[PDB]
């Protein structure tokens, strides 16, 4: 008989409320059975009882490490259904904060992966940088993480009068912190022993199982949604896409580090190219007017009242909108029946498919290797369970 | 436009082989990692002396809710119920009637602070700047009931925090 073991939910390596039922012969893993749903909150039904603006803060709490990226995907879906266009300055702000968010997510992923493996130190070095980016979030929206800044019309508020300078000051020091992380990990023989040839997935298998993002790029597949299906102003920035060679945990780690560097590159470009103008679509039947207009003009007051009580109506139709979120392809299948409430909202999270493939990726490995594989899949269970 | 992260081949000359043998036998990269940690030991820690020292915040910061007044001392809230309609958590409960002088005022104004997500949508929706999220964040209670705010509690919060709330609004209202 194989030993049957509960891995989580109350486990440090679990990375959330995961009940990994594991069959083991000695420490060899014979079978992985991920039991999820310990963080299923019934988000999609709730979204059905809300208006389109009331449903936005749910996308903050889907993947709690990539908040604005989740907001951007939902906003793109709703804007596509509304047949409107965000203004250019809003799109530049969106891309800038999406890259800052990608930095946040990649720091969290790499350091928690190292912490599982046993290298506890880089976490503390990188979480101070995460703290400074949380400060950027807070200055723009008043919240450290669940900002709700990106709205289906653009962004809620314009940047405060000295934010770009501080973002520049942060961005010109971050590369040295990445360098210190790489000094700790990249050439360590212990880290390579714990990561090289662990959780190897082929290109064909990665495509069929539904993988996306780094889980594809580590296996040599050349696919990045920002390059192939660009959104906002991603076609106007220059960056390279890291590609792996072996499909293992080590290659995925290198891809994420290089991705962090390329995000610094994109941020530098966005800082030097931010244009002037308004921040939300100049269409008061979709985006609320300014407060001075709301307090002086009859139409502005009527539209403020109606947008905050009933909300805008969205013409009937269904869309599937996908973005390159820091964890992979993040999608929304949004169905509108013509009213101000969404009829259906299905959320596609890359972690769902990655966790469904965890059992495949752990064949012939031990317990510690399974811990490394869970770390390398970059799983947050808010997006998996919803 | 792409780059490779692990497609480099190692040199096979005798010098390179001897350098790699020295790396294997004398553990050079491990000493590199030790040097990095030793370097961090001599830096100044990023720790702050809480509660004496506080983390930086912004005028846009979302905290505990408060109900404000006009400079005359009259309440700003007119019971339009836009905050109650917009609240994604349904955390606001409002009941209203004509006041003794015929004014349109609330008789019940509750916020369930354990339902609230602290999104700030209500202060955006308020047309008279009556409901705000003030700057306070240190209001942990010992019981659940203390976090079920009625109109008296919110008016008291407004009275207690008006000096800072008005200064925060003055610094941010031109972005709104």
């Amino acid at each position: 008989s194989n030993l049957t073991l509960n891995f989580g939910p109350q486990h440090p390596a679990a990375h959330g409320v995961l009940r990994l039922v594991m069959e083991l012969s000695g420490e060899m893993v014979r079978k992985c059975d991920p039991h999820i749903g310990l963080l299923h909150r019934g988000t999609e039904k709730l979204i059905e009882y809300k208006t389109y603006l009331q449903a936005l803060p749910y996308f903050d709490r889907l993947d709690y490490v990539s908040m604005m990226c989740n907001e951007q995907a939902y906003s793109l879906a709703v804007e596509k259904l509304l047949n409107i266009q965000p203004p250019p300055r809003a799109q530049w702000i969106r891309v800038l904060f999406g890259e800052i968010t990608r930095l946040l997510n990649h720091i969290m992923a790499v350091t928690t992966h190292a912490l599982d493996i046993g290298a506890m130190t880089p976490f503390f070095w990188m979480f101070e940088e995460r703290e400074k980016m949380f400060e950027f979030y807070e200055r723009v929206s008043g919240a450290r993480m669940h900002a709700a800044y990106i709205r289906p019309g653009g962004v809620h508020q314009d940047l405060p009068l000295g934010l770009l300078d501080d973002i520049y000051e942060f961005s010109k020091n971050f590369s040295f912190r990445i360098d210190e992380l790489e000094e700790m990990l990249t050439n360590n023989r212990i880290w390579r022993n714990r990561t090289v040839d662990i959780g190897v997935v082929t290109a064909e298998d990665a495509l069929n199982y539904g993988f996306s993002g780094v889980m594809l790029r580590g296996s040599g597949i050349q696919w990045d949604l920002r390059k192939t299906q660009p959104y906002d102003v991603y076609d106007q920035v220059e960056f390279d896409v890291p590609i792996g060679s072996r499909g293992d945990c080590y290659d995925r780690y290198l891809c994420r580090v290089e991705e962090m560097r390329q995000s610094l590159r994109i941020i530098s470009q966005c800082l030097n190219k931010m244009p002037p103008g308004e921040i939300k679509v100049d269409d008061a039947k979709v985006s609320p007017p300014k407060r001075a207009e709301m307090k002086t003009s009859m139409e502005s007051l009527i539209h403020h009242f109606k947008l905050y009580t009933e909300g805008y109506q969205v013409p009937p139709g269904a869309t599937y909108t996908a973005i390159e979120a820091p964890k992979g392809e993040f999608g929304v299948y949004l169905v509108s029946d013509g009213s101000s409430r969404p009829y259906r909202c299905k959320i596609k999270a890359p972690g769902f498919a990655h966790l469904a493939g965890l059992d495949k990726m752990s064949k012939g490995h031990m317990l510690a290797d399974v811990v490394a594989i869970i770390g390398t899949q970059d799983i947050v269970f808010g997006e998996v369970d919803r | 436009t792409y780059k490779f992260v692990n497609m480099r081949e190692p040199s096979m000359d005798m010098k390179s082989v001897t350098d790699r043998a020295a790396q294997t036998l004398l553990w050079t990269e491990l000493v590199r990692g030790l040097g990095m940690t030793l370097s961090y030991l001599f830096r100044e820690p990023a720790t702050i002396n809480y509660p004496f020292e506080k983390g930086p915040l912004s005028p846009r910061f979302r905290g505990e809710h408060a109900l404000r007044r006009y400079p005359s001392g009259e309440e700003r809230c007119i019971a339009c119920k836009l905050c109650e309609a917009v609240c994604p958590a349904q955390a606001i409960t409002i009941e209203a009637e004509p006041r003794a002088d015929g004014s349109r005022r609330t008789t019940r104004y509750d916020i369930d602070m354990t339902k609230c997500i602290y999104c700030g949508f209500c202060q955006e929706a308020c047309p008279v700047d009556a409901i705000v999220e003030g700057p306070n964040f240190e209001f942990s209670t010992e019981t659940h009931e203390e976090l079920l705010y009625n109109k008296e509690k919110l008016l008291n919060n407004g009275d207690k925090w008006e000096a800072e709330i008005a200064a925060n609004i003055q610094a941010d209202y031109l972005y709104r």
Binding site: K172, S175 | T18
Partner: peptide, 29 residues
């Protein structure tokens, strides 16, 4: 008649930001 004031990059541009990996050799033979 006040002019538009808005958070923008300074005239010309911001100073260049390093992003490439910097791992020195740092050893004997």
């Amino acid at each position: 008649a006040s002019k538009v004031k808005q958070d923008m990059p300074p005239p010309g541009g911001y100073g260049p930001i390093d992003y490439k990996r910097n791992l020195p050799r740092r050893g004997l033979s």
